[PDB]
Amino acid sequence: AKALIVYGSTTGNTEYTAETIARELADAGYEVDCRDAASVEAGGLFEGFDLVLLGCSTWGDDSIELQDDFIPLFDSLEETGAQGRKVACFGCGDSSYEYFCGAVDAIEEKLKNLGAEIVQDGLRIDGDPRAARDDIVGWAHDVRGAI
Ligand SMILES: Cc1cc2nc3c(=O)[nH]c(=O)nc-3n(C[C@H](O)[C@H](O)[C@H](O)COP(=O)(O)O)c2cc1C
């Protein structure tokens, strides 16, 4: 199994999430390519991947904005090869904002509309990812089954 993890992270929380999930899937024997969304090109981005995991934190006060690096990729997602792709999504935010990890909800909606196959409900981390390290490792373990 070949996985691609793309993450948008401002303060490092989701990047630490994506590292932790990449180590879990590498430990289980998946090939893993993990990339900062700021370095990537939407063009056929997901071709050849058995599993694609997209991580993005949430910004904004009364509106949901996606993490700033991730926006460009999000806007071209139809250009990626997501139809039929087995995909899941994750992100850090904070339960005291009106839309808690609303970026994870906006990337899942867009992915579902594309015919993506979401194997697992989104990982939404409230607070510091280093405290929810346990739920991060189990979510990765669990996405390896939805497959
Ligand atoms: C100004 C501001 C606005 C934010 N808005 C939201 C939000 O609407 N929903 C949410 O769940 N978290 C929100 N957050 C929480 C951040 O997503 C959280 O701090 C996250 O740990 C950042 O992840 P990052 O380090 O990967 O970019 C906000 C944080 C700040 C400072």
Return all residues near 98 (Cβ < 8 A) that are at least 6 apart.
62
The enclosing H or E element of 23 equals: helix 13-28
Spatial distance between the Cα atoms of 68 and 61, rounded to a whole number of angstroms? 15
SS3 at position 65: strand
**Which domains are present in the chain?**
1-147 (3.40.50.360)
How many other C-beta atoms are found inside a 10 Å radius of the C-beta of residue 69?
A: 21
Question: Within 13 Å, how many C-alpha atoms sit on residue 10's CB side?
Answer: 11
Cβ of 58 closer than 6 Å to ligand 1, yes or no, is yes
Interaxial angle between packed helices 133-146 and 13-28, expressed in degrees from 0 to 180 and rounded to the nearest 10? 50
- Experimental approach: X-ray
SS3 at position 105: helix
Cβ of 13 closer than 6 Å to ligand 1, yes or no, is yes
CB 130 within 8 A of CB 16: yes
The enclosing H or E element of 121 equals: strand 117-126
Which residues face 123 on adjacent strands? 90
Tokens 């910004």 belong to residue: 59
How many other C-beta atoms are found inside a 10 Å radius of the C-beta of residue 135?
A: 13
How many other C-beta atoms are found inside a 10 Å radius of the C-beta of residue 51?
A: 22
CA 53 to chain centre: 5
CB 90 within 8 A of CB 139: yes
Ligand 1 pocket: which of 58, 61, 65, 101 to mutate (most atoms within 8 A of CB): 58
Extract the runs of DSSP E, i.e. beta strands, from 1-147.
2-8, 31-36, 51-56, 58-59, 65-66, 86-93, 117-126
Extract the runs of DSSP E, i.e. beta strands, from 45-108.
51-56, 58-59, 65-66, 86-93
Spatial distance between the Cα atoms of 132 and 125, rounded to a whole number of angstroms? 7
Distance 11 CA to ligand 1 centre (A): 9
CB 129 within 8 A of CB 92: yes
Cβ of 17 closer than 6 Å to ligand 1, yes or no, is no
